[PDB]
Amino acid sequence: KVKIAVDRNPVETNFEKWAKPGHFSRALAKGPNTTTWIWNLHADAHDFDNHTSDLEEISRKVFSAHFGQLGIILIWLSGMYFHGARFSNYEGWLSDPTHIKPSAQVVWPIVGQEILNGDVGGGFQGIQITSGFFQLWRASGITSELQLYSTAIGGLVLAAACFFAGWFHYHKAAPKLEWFQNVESMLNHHLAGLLGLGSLAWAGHQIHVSLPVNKLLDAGVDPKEIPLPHEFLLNQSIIADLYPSFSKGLAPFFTLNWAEYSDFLTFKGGLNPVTGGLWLSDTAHHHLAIAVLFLVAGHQYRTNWGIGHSIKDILESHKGPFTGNGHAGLYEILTTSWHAQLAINLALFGSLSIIVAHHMYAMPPYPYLATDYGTQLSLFTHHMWIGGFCVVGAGAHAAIFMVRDYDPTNNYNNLLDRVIRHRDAIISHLNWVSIFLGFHSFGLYIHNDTMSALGRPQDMFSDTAIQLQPVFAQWIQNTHFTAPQLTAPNALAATSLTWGGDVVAVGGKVAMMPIALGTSDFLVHHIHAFTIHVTVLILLKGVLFARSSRLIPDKANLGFRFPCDGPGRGGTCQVSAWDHVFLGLFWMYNSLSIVIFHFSWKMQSDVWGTVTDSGVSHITGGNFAQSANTINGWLRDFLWAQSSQVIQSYGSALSAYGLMFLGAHFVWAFSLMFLFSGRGYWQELIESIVWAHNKLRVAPSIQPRALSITQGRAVGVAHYLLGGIATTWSFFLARIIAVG
Amino acid sequence: AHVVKIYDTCIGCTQCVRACPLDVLEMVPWDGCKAAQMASSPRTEDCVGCKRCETACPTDFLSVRVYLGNESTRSLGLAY
Amino acid sequence: YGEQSKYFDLQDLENTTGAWDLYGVDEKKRYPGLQEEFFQRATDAVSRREALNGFVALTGVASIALFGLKGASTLELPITKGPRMEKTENGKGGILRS
Amino acid sequence: PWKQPELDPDTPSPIFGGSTGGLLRKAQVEEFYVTTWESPKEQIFEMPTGGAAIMRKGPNLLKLARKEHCLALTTQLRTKFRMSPCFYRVYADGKVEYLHPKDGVYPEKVNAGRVGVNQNMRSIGKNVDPIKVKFTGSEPFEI
Amino acid sequence: KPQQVIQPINGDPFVGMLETPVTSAPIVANYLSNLPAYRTGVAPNLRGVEIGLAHGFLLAGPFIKLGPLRDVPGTAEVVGCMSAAGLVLILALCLSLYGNAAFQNQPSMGKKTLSGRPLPQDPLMSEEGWAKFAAGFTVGGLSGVAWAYILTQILPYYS
Amino acid sequence: DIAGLTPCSESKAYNKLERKELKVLDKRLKKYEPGSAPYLALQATKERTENRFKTYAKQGLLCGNDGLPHLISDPGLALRFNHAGEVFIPTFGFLYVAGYIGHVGRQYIILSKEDAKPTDKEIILDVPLALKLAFQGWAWPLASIQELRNGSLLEKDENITVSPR
Ligand code: CLA
Ligand code: CLA
């Protein structure tokens, strides 16, 4: 049944459609009469639903779009590898990671930029990087710049191959709709094939390459005399002395004697004390087990050989009486709607990126990464924000599916129809829990601020005063600390040092230390729960009310992204689901900003610091247990106690962070024009400017028009988000570079 | 409720009555246009002021005009 | 109403619009008989909204006036206690007023 | 139309599940709206306030809390199936009103049987300034 | 045999509720129908007596336990109780204001209990009936505040 | 010596600022060997700093109470005293280029408007005519003056869209 249906040469390879920029849309194919034609051109550029109603052409378009994005990412990765090969101090950083700051961007001496080439050590000057590529290139065993050059050239070659693949798979040999609808084959090939094959290849690379290099690196051996990994691969004698189980030579694997592999496939809890990262043997056994789990899970579905699982049968068979028809039609929706699958994949990708950030801040998987506070903070914040963006986009594309690809014929009493039916109950209960969480988190904060202001600290919600001890989180911490004792007896120590009892430190700085949770952590965590509940309320309400509502019954026929239905019913402004996503972007911004503020303050006040002989001294004075209970304490002891290096960064290596900070302030403040204002005033001002240009005959043939209401909202939210993100980025990076 | 007025510039494409999902506008015979039609608003008390007829109006300036003010339980679009 | 598929009849429109008391009973005097007249005589002097608005205001203004005049300084509220010796001078950058 | 039709209490209603979006206390206190149509067969439509409901072969009855819901359902039916339905209004005291065309051949047509109301013979923009109608109670567009 | 637990109320898919096990449970329905606010045959002052007693007994607790003078022994149990009594008086004033506001007109449409049999009019839905209800509420609240006060004086445990 | 500003050649705060900048720049010089490429870049930066301080002085530039040079904006005062290079000659220097862009934009707008569907010409530029007008705009004020007198530059408002107030 499953086969390869491909149509050969559907689209000629020519610049004929490049000559006319407006060709995907028949409304834009006429000409640019108004200036809104350009914004509609760059807006409907990748909206493939209104380009054509055929699902096959849309599938080919998005297939080659993913190919182009893959080629772009491969070009970017090859450029990063080339930068590490040519303009970097990776050779110096390998011989001294605890004293030489990483640097991989070198500026030109053109206009005053020589001050940005900071003294990072090792006889090298450049921009002190924060991506942590040096830690990754130390984990994956890389010694010289020749290897980075080879990796960069291979990445460029694969990027060219990916772009050629996109061109081929669209213009030359385009697959048919039945090829894309083979969901079982897709799932099997991207579970066993992609994930499983990549995990097994990475486990093999770690076992045969990264393990000996990292074993020789932390032993004090200089990387110059470290043997190249091909010597470890070909010769069993060199790999036998570092790991005695290699002398057996694949005998225990087939004879079921895997306990003999306990030297380089270890099960150890904690971090390597020499480097501060996870043990590479633990990561090798981890990726090998992940490859096993994905090889077994990739043979579940039925494609062509009878055996397996049919997803339609699995969905239609799970029917429970409070749900009526149980998952009855979801196979038909998910095999015919690109936006529904986009929403699911984006939501899971964003959540998994959030897990990625949390589990890198928890267990650093790279050598000399925990002590490099800047790389850890940047990785956590960056993947935090990318996960939030993917979740918000998931809500947006779910709303788009609701408007466009949802039909009432296939669904009568299924789960989606019943979610539509009781949407008011869901929204009302979410509003109740929203108000409840908002009050008994933020009103607790305001009450603590008031009792501090009224001179009554004994009436506050603090540890010294009456406290809200997070008993559940502390019990989970104690259970995980005592988990290797009873429930996981084969583990050497705890899986992370969040709940441990020992402090590791590399180079005199604290790598990872136990984290204490108090009343302030309780308040911030319930603030986070409140904020996430509000954002999910906004996104879910936008998705649910995109089709119809008690206000506007015909919202389905008005499209997804429309400004309003007029000032009727008192004014139906921002009633579209697009505007719900537009507000949810700001609520996401508030949520993740408070989350990363909590991360930075907690880690600087209770984890990060320099170890001494007389106890452990943190970066701050350990004031998180005393100042995070009030808003003014938060402000003064996080945004004002820090950022003293950003303002005084001028004349130093990090002055560009101050410039970026003030430019971010500019863009964040410039957005409020497009947010507060409307269009009629701007259109009338444009009319006056048009009269001015008409007076002396410089009238453009294209009529100047003000931005659309949805266009204005998009510009406002984009400038606001860019300004806020760059503000927090500059402040965080300058604080963590000038101090950490 | 709101006041909806139709001027003599109307020429009768009978499309402003389709864009109104409230049955406010009706079409009467006339003699001042080629189509011999003119928009009328008999149930002007049932209008909310959504201005969809204004979006559907092709004349410059618009033949049909909706003026806000004096809101009621039906012009506010409440089902409660 | 509700014979096979109909939900509207226009002579029992009390059922058509959906006005239904889901939790409503007509059981009279569930409490024991001697218990009512103790509280029935309690309410009859304050049953009128004029008598109740006055009584709440009577206990309102009098107890509010009692607080501060007599209500404070018996609970030792920290507003009518006075200072020991704090905050005569002001200004850390010099000048030292008062 | 030719004769004004009165809705029948006996007519069935489409099968539907419990939807939170529906009739409110305004149906009890104030008026509510009722939509009727005659069906050729059993088809699936989407209610303007709920999900999807399978309708009955023959007469049908919908109750909507707003007239906008009624005309949204009317436009959906006319677009999808060329259905041509009609809706009514039922008051609190039991009074029944007919708002969907009293002429019966829809506002899109003319029928030469309705009188022009709220029509100005002057052009838009030829109206007088508000100073000329100040302290009179009449707006310039109301003249 | 699908066991369609989730169904609309009275088989009517047009109105707000759908009969759900949160609503259609016999224990929940019996507990809600036996609550004083749904005893339609009982006089509204007798409703308000029980309602005010329960609410004034519960409202004393947070004021004693988390009051500004909670650390002062012997005086917290009186300050919390008189503040609870003041809160009961405030709620009684707002109840009387609601009774003035919402019953300046006359209702004309009944409640229609299930399968018919409706009584003429709820006395709670009237002006003087709601005034009597608020009177019962404030008397019950004051008595409950005094009872929670004397329960903090004589005690075998805590307060 | 106008407005109480000493010349930059005889200013103590100007030389103190130069000494302070040379001190911090030489502070980074002690962390690198003299035969290294960062040392050469730092040496070139110091040479550029010394050349800038020398060229900013002895050029009529002045400063007051800060060590940072000041600019004189009043014409005549910048002409009697040698200060026309600060803003007086850059004023005509910018206006020449500013009038260059305005003139070539006007000629392209006029040329494109006398063509079928002129809205396409704004998004589909033509290179030979735009580049010809780009290299035929050196005498922009001479073309601007002659069009001003004869009405080709301006337009009477009877064919200009005006507000209906
Ligand atoms: C085991 C086989 C296999 C493997 C490994 C993949 C791998 C991939 N597929 Mg999948 N796919 C498969 C079978 C497979 N496919 C089948 C059988 C179908 C039909 C049902 C599809 C249909 C399909 C669609 C519709 C889409 C993908 C996409 C993708 C990419 C997702 C990008 C990502 O997650 O980052 C991982 C990124 C990398 C690993 C970068 C390296 C990419 C290398 C060059 C690809 C090599 C794998 C390939 C199968 C080798 C054979 C191809 C040969 C003709 C040269 C990923 C490379 C997306 C896409 O367009 O990207 C191409 C997408 O939208 N797949
Ligand atoms: C898996 C990723 C993915 C995919 C495949 C799509 C695909 C699609 N989305 Mg979705 N979306 C995503 C992620 C994704 N999106 C995320 C993460 C968000 C949250 C921000 C959204 C939010 C979103 C909305 C709100 C809408 C879409 C729409 C669309 C459609 C057209 C998009 C288009 O033409 O953009 C055109 C491309 C651009 C306009 C360029 C982007 C420029 C942005 C605004 C600024 C970027 C600045 C950059 C970050 C920094 C530069 C700084 C500057 C100084 C240079 C298409 C179906 C639209 C639609 O109609 O759907 C059918 C629509 O309304 N999406």
Ligand code: CLA
């Ligand atoms: C920090 C700025 C800020 C604040 C505080 C609010 C506050 C609010 N917004 Mg908003 N929001 C803002 C900016 C803000 N907004 C911006 C800029 C946008 C545009 C993107 C939005 C977008 C937005 C959406 C899309 C939604 C909200 C909602 C809400 C509500 C959440 C209530 C809650 O759970 O918290 C609890 C209440 C508070 C934090 C308010 C302050 C309470 C203090 C502590 C006083 C406590 C009681 C006090 C003593 C009483 C005083 C008595 C006095 C009168 C005598 C609330 C009214 C949501 C809503 O309606 O609720 C679900 C909602 O859906 N807002």
Ligand code: CLA
């Ligand atoms: C070359 C074309 C051209 C010309 C001659 C003018 C001329 C004028 N404009 Mg306009 N303007 C233009 C393009 C042009 N504008 C464009 C493209 C925009 C959009 C960004 C604007 C936006 C604009 C506003 C918002 C305002 C003016 C105003 C003015 C007046 C003040 C002079 C000035 O410098 O304004 C300042 C002009 C700008 C800041 C716009 C700069 C944009 C660049 C420089 C134009 C690029 C054009 C391009 C290079 C030409 C193509 C060359 C060809 C060979 C292909 C004057 C009548 C003002 C007015 O009403 O005064 C009475 C006013 O408020 N203009």
Ligand SMILES: CC1=C(\C=C/C(C)=C/C=C/C(C)=C/C=C/C=C(C)/C=C/C=C(C)/C=C/C2=C(C)CCCC2(C)C)C(C)(C)CCC1
């Ligand atoms: C990263 C990167 C790179 C680099 C490197 C690489 C990538 C290399 C290679 C690699 C490879 C090339 C790999 C491979 C792998 C493999 C595997 C992983 C396998 C597996 C297997 C399985 C799963 C199974 C098997 C078997 C058995 C066991 C038995 C018998 C049967 C059979 C045979 C089936 C490049 C530049 C390119 C690009 C960019 C990025």
Ligand SMILES: CC1=C(C/C=C(\C)CCC[C@H](C)CCC[C@H](C)CCCC(C)C)C(=O)c2ccccc2C1=O
């Ligand atoms: C300011 C504003 C405008 C006016 C803004 C417009 C017309 C967009 C202008 C975009 C410009 C033309 C893009 C290019 C900017 C500069 C010309 C770039 C200069 C680059 C240098 C190298 C010269 C709206 O139209 C609007 C609409 C709806 C809500 C809010 C607003 C709103 O706030």
Ligand code: SF4
């Ligand atoms: S202000 Fe704008 S968004 Fe709001 S109803 Fe008017 S036109 Fe629509």
